[PDB]
């Protein structure tokens, strides 16, 4: 496959200013096997909506033991939550960032 990132470098909260990139994510697997095996969000907008509107409290604690953090459940959920203001058309980002919301309430 071939792939890095940035796994050692964070900053203070006043970054307003970016070009298009995903945010990071766990020395453990990718982005299609940190969400549809891990959060139960599926792909699709529905597989987030099926596993948000009605989550438990196992279904946090769970992330943690595959290799996350909080950290992973801050950027995933504001990066989704940002793509929500230019393209209001976008359900899917909206259930991921919602079920981010819900995990870090259960932390």
């Given at each position: 496959?071939?792939?890095?990132?940035?796994?050692?470098?964070?900053?203070?909260?006043?970054?307003?200013?970016?070009?298009?990139?995903?945010?990071?994510?766990?020395?453990?697997?990718?982005?299609?096997?940190?969400?549809?095996?891990?959060?139960?969000?599926?792909?699709?907008?529905?597989?987030?909506?099926?596993?948000?509107?009605?989550?438990?409290?196992?279904?946090?604690?769970?992330?943690?033991?595959?290799?996350?953090?909080?950290?992973?459940?801050?950027?995933?959920?504001?990066?989704?939550?940002?793509?929500?203001?230019r393209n209001?058309?976008?359900?899917?980002?909206?259930?991921?960032?919602?079920?981010?919301?819900?995990?870090?309430?259960?932390?």
């Amino acid at each position: 496959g071939t792939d890095f990132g940035t796994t050692n470098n964070f900053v203070s909260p006043n970054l307003q200013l970016k070009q298009n990139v995903l945010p990071p994510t766990p020395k453990n697997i990718p982005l299609p096997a940190f969400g549809q095996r891990i959060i139960g969000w599926g792909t699709g907008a529905e597989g987030a909506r099926q596993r948000l509107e009605n989550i438990q409290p196992a279904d946090v604690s769970m992330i943690k033991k595959q290799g996350t953090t909080l950290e992973m459940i801050t950027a995933w959920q504001d990066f989704y939550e940002q793509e929500q203001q230019r393209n209001e058309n976008n359900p899917t980002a909206k259930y991921r960032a919602r079920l981010m919301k819900k995990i870090a309430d259960l932390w």
